[PDB]
DNA sequence: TGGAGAATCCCGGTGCCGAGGCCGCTCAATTGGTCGTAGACAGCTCTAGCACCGCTTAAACGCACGTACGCGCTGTCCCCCGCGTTTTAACCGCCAAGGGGATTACTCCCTAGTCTCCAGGCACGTGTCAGATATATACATCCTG
DNA sequence: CAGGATGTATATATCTGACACGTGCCTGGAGACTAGGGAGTAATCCCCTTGGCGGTTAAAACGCGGGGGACAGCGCGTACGTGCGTTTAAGCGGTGCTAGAGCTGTCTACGACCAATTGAGCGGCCTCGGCACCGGGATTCTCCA
């Protein structure tokens, strides 16, 4: 037998911390999983291309930050960069 | 009683934009997909979700094409959509070149 | 003895799987090596975007007097917002329908 | 054979209604079903070749999703 | 006949481009 | 006196500029425009000449494509002159707005 | 720098329209094209500057512009 | 002692480099490992496509009474071909100009 | 001293074996180089995605075959497949 | 249906600078072996696809009337075009300073890899509540007189 | 502007099946350690970017005269909308057969890795002829009498 992984638990946790009284359907969860996978693939591919262009062999935070700035538009890019930088700082402070 | 032409069309637009179900009958679309596919490989089998995904994508594409076509038809001082408008929308979108 | 295990997601304060994201980056053949801080940043970005979409979808669902988010609510939230609609312009959401709009020319006099 | 007639006139009419169209000319239906056939051929060719690569005989929904994504029309809801 | 000096290695009848003609 | 009937020397201009490959925007004002726009994103930037050249080539190619599209939009409306509404319709159908 | 969009003169827009096959031009097309070109240039130069900032250099190279154009669906041949 | 080297391009009868394509496939981070027959197939496809485009461009240059191919000739060759144009629909060629086309409505009558 | 790689030698050999009395400009050699790199990247990326989809970890001729069938339109693909298969068969024959 | 003139096309002489071929050489592909494992193949399973049959009835099909929209014709006048003049600044050529792209050395510290340990998330069961459905409304909307 | 007909939003009661939770468990994520080379920092070279000046002149701005066309209006007639009645085949259910998708177990031929070797292709550097340009003549096309 084999198991399949998904982001259902994390999407549900985020939803419950955003809208405590609101549930989410199975089809909506599938769409959110597809969205998360798509955004992950976009950012990861852009970061890989950025690493290849500069002849770096590593994907670091700055590569991900530059990717996020490249795909995400405007205010989304600004807020996402802020959130990522805050998370990285908190992680490295441990 | 007799509604003047146009009002029923407007209420149909307000209905089908509000609702979210599929608009093409399921079985003829299944048969169309199957007969189109047999030109590539014979005796092919289709997962039900595959046919459903094909129908969803086809209806979304047709609805977007009809939006662009209505924009083109209105641009020409008309309200009646015509095949010329479909051709213009397809070419400007880049699907005819 | 080994210390108590603390998930890297818990260290960063996120809800998304930093470990799983690190594995996916490492195994997905994106680069020869993946830095330590890349999964944290990517997980934070993904969680932020998901939080935005879920917040807008929940607002739309409340406007519809419903408790469960359905794909129609996701479509409404994504298309109504100007930034998400640009981020997901070439994305089709199954069972999402279309935004209700009618060209002003066609409305009756 | 002859199954493009299954995309009947009222079906295209209500697809146009969802698209926002007020009234429709009679020559639209044939053009619309021709366009639909072209799109279906374009997508199904890539789907079936995806299945050929995997040595399969069932066109799974993942193949259709991959074909749509590579055509620039990514689909959310099926994988 | 189109070919290469290594035959039919190239397609011997390339398709001509068409362009859209609006109006009449 | 001798004067060409309006339209003919407009057609000759079309044939003159569809045959050549030269740039149609003067180089110095375009370079100044590029530098002025780039001053918004980062100060004291330096541009390689090839960078400005590539920006100009891409910009005029995009403008030429847009002008073909708006010409088609204008002709579809049964008129010859192109108006800003035609450009807006072309951009909307192209998906740029 | 200031008001350099006026350097995209009316004759230049007219010639670009002539290359596009346009026979007759309205008077507002010039301002409309000024706006469209400004938007396009802003979008491309934003990504070019992002690339040149990530590379940690002050000189916007040709490859940065090529990469910026490629990722927007406007692949350009000739410089890289 | 060992036998004289025979390049894999010579072995396959191609002109494009099999070894360089193999290295680019391996170092390009496309997959964990690359099969021995992959570079040969890729080089053959690239050689065929270049031969096609250069043949059409040479024909176009001969139509202009020029013995050197310039980007204008490449542009003419690529756009005059339906399938090649479909392949390079989104590609812009610098110094290429446009295909001469005037809408039949604009022409005098 | 650094070295910059290009397909100029091979492109010129192909040109001289398809148009023996025709040259090429450097500004056109650059465009041919860019086209070769673009098509290489397209085919290799499609092959990588095909390998990932099927959970394989090797890029073989089958992956490139399917990538060619997916990318090149119509008779272009029909002829590229034949050229590739013939080249691979000749290579294995040695 | 003919000439005038304006533009285009065509032919010949000349200079040049960009393409083509040649000469080191170096570093990257080739050859020869080895080893680990990813993929090929046999075998088994049981899930999901295909096929069939009967009923209900929602939806498509066919038809008639007329009315509102498409299309053609007409008038205008004002906007755009073609051409002459003049004022502007792009363009080319040359000089000069130096900011910063590009490369080399070196080391250290960050990542890969391994082993061990354990809990987070996956699969399976499940019982209730959110949502779909039926029906009687009071209500808003369209239309004609 | 008012009344009739009719979609339509609303509230209540009903059903039901999808989901949010709980349990068991296993496998992948975390902790601790070592090894190694990727890249971060320092230093230097010199490339090419920016700034400036002067002269030519090609192009941009400006203005004027007039005509082709964009827009509004009128009229006509087809054709598409709306509603009614009559097929029809889609949808739903139920069942049965089995094709092949997926999983598991072996096993081998295939690709990575390493060391020695050498020639393929890059860098520089000629040299000359393809072509870009100028001058002049021939042909074509558009316009008006």
XYZ file of C-alpha atoms in Angstrom, chain I residues 28-67:
40
model
C 22.428 36.327 -37.791
C 24.813 33.806 -36.247
C 23.820 35.237 -32.878
C 20.137 34.778 -33.680
C 20.753 31.178 -34.737
C 22.649 30.599 -31.478
C 19.754 32.040 -29.489
C 17.273 29.851 -31.367
C 19.360 26.735 -30.728
C 19.608 27.525 -27.015
C 15.875 28.256 -26.800
C 14.874 24.987 -28.468
C 17.396 23.060 -26.360
C 15.921 24.569 -23.199
C 12.340 23.855 -24.282
C 13.014 20.209 -25.123
C 15.157 19.577 -22.041
C 12.590 21.174 -19.739
C 9.767 19.126 -21.219
C 11.882 15.978 -20.863
C 12.605 16.822 -17.224
C 8.907 17.333 -16.518
C 8.086 14.050 -18.275
C 10.630 12.232 -16.110
C 9.218 13.851 -12.966
C 5.617 13.024 -13.910
C 6.328 9.293 -14.256
C 8.644 9.218 -11.194
C 11.597 8.221 -13.361
C 15.025 9.694 -12.664
C 16.677 9.290 -16.091
C 16.294 11.297 -19.300
C 16.344 8.876 -22.240
C 15.405 9.057 -25.909
C 11.780 8.249 -25.046
C 11.478 11.399 -22.933
C 12.998 13.509 -25.706
C 10.795 11.729 -28.253
C 7.663 12.712 -26.349
C 8.985 16.238 -25.785
